[PDB]
Design a protein around this ligand. Structure first.
Ligand SMILES: Nc1ncnc2c1ncn2[C@@H]1O[C@H](COP(=O)(O)OP(=O)(O)NP(=O)(O)O)[C@@H](O)[C@H]1O
Lengths: 16, 303
């Protein structure tokens, strides 16, 4: 769960 | 860029703890009057006051339980009472007479983070607060031997002084853990709803990584502007739970509108600070960063 969340946040910076 | 982590006041030259007279504290608070109160119920009452020397202090009057020792008094005296650092509340003195046990802190202008964050903090200001509070906790874990485990890190135990800098406080539950150990065995569940790390609900053991979990929460509060529990948006979840489920959807909604509004170009830095928070909130204690790593994550983000 947590690491999924961590991936999500990394996408978000990339997806800026 | 090489940083020396701890270089705070050398204790040997510090003003020692002043043993105070109960009558003086009694008078300075107007008989511990109610309009002098600034904190109620938790292990004592805290009163704002000005001493004989003009110094503004907060006086915590500890509640004496019949047939009992002064465990919470000693916890502060043996910990915060022995150390000084710019990111820790200054304990200036104490009063110990009969069954009375009082603790006198230097008064921190803006009271607690919680009080402020809900009832003016820009990002740069909040960034400084997370960093300083990380430094304070790091001091406890890494620069003290035996180590200090705070056991109750929360946004109400982060005070803010004149220049809005963070000061970790409330050492009533703090414990000393030999550097040779990895954990300390405690007798009971201690902590504040919203902040308790998962493993504390499985076993009566505290550790520094316990404190690191609780810190992560305080960081959410700064990033989101939410209370750790009981907000309407949460539902069946807490702040931690909410941020978790919410993020697959639209991460940046989790962020405080006020910060987002100030500038749309800090949406990236905000996101990077959330990574730190999430790392601290790992279900596996060993995977959480130490507070020294958290500080390093913070300073990397900037550069
Ligand atoms: N040195 C200080 N300077 C300014 N305000 C202080 C100081 N010490 C305590 N306070 C205030 O008193 C409140 C908390 O007192 P304290 O009992 O030490 O923590 P508390 O854990 O949140 N008690 P509780 O809320 O029942 O758990 C804070 O909200 C502050 O407003």
């Amino acid at each position: 769960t947590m690491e999924e969340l961590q991936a999500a946040i990394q996408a978000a910076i990339a997806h800026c | 860029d090489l940083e020396v982590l701890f270089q705070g006041p050398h204790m040997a030259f510090e003003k020692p703890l002043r043993k105070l007279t109960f009558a003086d504290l009694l008078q300075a608070t107007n008989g511990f009057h109610n309009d002098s109160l600034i904190g109620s119920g938790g292990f004592g009452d805290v009163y704002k006051a000005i001493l004989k020397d003009g110094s503004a202090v907060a006086i915590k009057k500890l509640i004496h339980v019949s047939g009992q020792g002064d465990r919470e008094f000693m916890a502060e005296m043996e910990t915060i009472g022995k150390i000084k650092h710019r990111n820790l509340v200054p304990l200036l003195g104490y009063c110990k007479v009969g069954d009375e046990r009082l603790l006198v802190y230097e008064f921190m202008k803006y009271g607690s983070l919680e009080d402020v964050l809900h009832d003016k903090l820009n990002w740069s200001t909040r960034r400084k607060i997370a960093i300083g509070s990380a430094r304070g906790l790091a001091f406890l874990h890494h620069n003290c031997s035996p180590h200090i485990i705070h056991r109750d890190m929360k946004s109400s135990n982060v005070l803010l002084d004149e220049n809005l800098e963070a000061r970790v406080s409330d050492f009533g539950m703090a414990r000393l853990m030999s550097a040779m150990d990895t954990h300390l065995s405690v007798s009971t569940l201690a902590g504040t709803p919203g902040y308790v790390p998962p493993e504390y609900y499985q076993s009566f053991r505290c550790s520094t990584k316990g404190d690191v979990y609780s810190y992560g929460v305080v960081l959410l509060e700064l990033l989101t502007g939410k209370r750790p529990t009981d907000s309407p948006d949460f539902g069946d979840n807490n702040l931690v739970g909410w941020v978790k489920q919410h993020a697959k959807l639209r991460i940046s909604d989790v962020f405080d509108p006020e910060l987002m509004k100030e500038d749309p170009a800090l949406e990236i830095e905000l996101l990077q600070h959330l990574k730190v928070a999430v790392a601290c909130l790992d279900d596996r204690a060993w995977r959480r960063p130490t507070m020294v790593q958290v500080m390093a994550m913070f300073k990397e983000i900037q550069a």
